[PDB]
């Protein structure tokens, strides 16, 4: 049962999420994310640090990136 979609500007960058199991984009570039058995999430730029939701993983990625473009 998938999380809801989201779309917002976070620290100046557009973050979007949508069910697909779930896709996240940072300024239109896909951010790979993964769901853990307990329902938390990680992303490929925070792969050892569970956060509760795909939006939390998108925000953590924007924090980690410090303005840098994501690579596809």
């Amino acid at each position: 049962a998938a999380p809801e979609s989201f779309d917002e500007v976070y620290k100046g960058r557009r973050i979007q999420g949508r069910p697909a199991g779930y896709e996240v984009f940072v300024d239109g570039v896909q951010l790979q994310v993964m769901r853990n058995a307990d329902g938390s999430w990680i992303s490929v730029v925070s792969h050892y640090d569970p956060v509760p939701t795909p939006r939390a993983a998108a925000r953590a990625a924007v924090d980690e990136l410090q303005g840098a473009p994501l690579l596809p």
Partner: protein
């Protein structure tokens, strides 16, 4: 081959380790280790096939991956072995590990860039090629995203767990493997990745040479656990979908099983590893 605590290396052993790592990087071989790790960590999932992570084979998989890397180092300089970082003892930014003659220090505050040591971007010798974003320089933020490394008492609580692993054999499991990996409990191995920050906190974490020293100590803790629990062994032992059973082979090598990797002494010993005792 003896794997030694990084804190104990001589100046000549640090010099030789660094030079062998930099030659694997120059020749293009190093980056393929980064790529292999990222491919597995991105495909290992709690609900499907899982080999390198979030699964019982997390420990033999990283043991074989580290053996591949150590053999590549030895092809450059046969005297080099992988040292290990006991992060429960060497737990501050002041540890000699992070000195300019070894791994260099933390990243500067503006962009996380490591500014000293042999792997600093300014040397021209450590381009970050296998990456998830535009930045091509090594980054760290020691103690930035999580305040403390595990302590020895926390490690000892994990080492006291008797079962190797438990159904459902994933990040939800009770048992030693998942507590060492860190998805449940006081969190050992995942928290160290988070504590270093930079690339070490991402799927392309072998971009930081500390990756190997972290995993060599995780590997030593599996050896310590076996000494503590000579009566316990790898599970599962057959017919488990999506999970590598004891006698099944592991990707990417396909020609090795967890059973072939349980006894490290067939490949290396440690400077110190206590015998079984009570």
């Amino acid at each position: 081959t003896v794997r030694k605590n990084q804190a104990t290396l001589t100046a000549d052993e640090k010099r030789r380790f660094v030079a062998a790592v930099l030659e694997l990087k120059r020749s293009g071989r190093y980056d393929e280790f980064v790529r292999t790790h990222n491919e597995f960590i991105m495909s290992d999932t709690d609900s499907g096939e899982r080999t390198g992570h979030r699964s019982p084979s997390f420990l033999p998989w990283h043991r074989r991956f580290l053996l591949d890397f150590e053999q590549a180092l030895q092809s450059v300089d046969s005297s080099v072995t992988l040292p290990y970082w006991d992060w429960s003892a060497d737990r501050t930014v002041r540890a000699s590990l992070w000195a300019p003659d070894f791994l260099g220090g933390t990243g500067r505050s503006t962009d996380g860039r490591v500014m000293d040591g042999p792997f600093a971007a300014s040397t021209g010798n450590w381009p970050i090629n296998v990456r998830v974003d535009s930045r091509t320089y090594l980054r760290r933020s020691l103690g930035g995203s999580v305040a403390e490394l595990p302590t020895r008492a926390e490690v000892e609580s994990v080492l006291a767990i008797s079962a190797y692993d438990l159904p459902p054999y994933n990040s939800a499991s009770e048992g030693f493997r998942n507590h060492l990996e860190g998805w449940r409990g006081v969190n050992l191995h995942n928290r160290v990745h988070v504590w270093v920050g930079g690339q070490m906190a991402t799927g392309v974490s072998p971009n930081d040479p500390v990756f190997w020293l972290h995993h060599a100590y995780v590997d030593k803790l599996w050896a310590e656990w076996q000494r503590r629990h000579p009566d316990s062994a790898y599970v599962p032992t057959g017919g488990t979908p999506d999970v590598v059973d004891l006698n099944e082979t592991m990707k990417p090598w396909n020609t090795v099983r967890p059973a072939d990797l349980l006894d490290h002494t067939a490949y290396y010993t440690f400077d110190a590893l206590e015998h079984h005792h009570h």
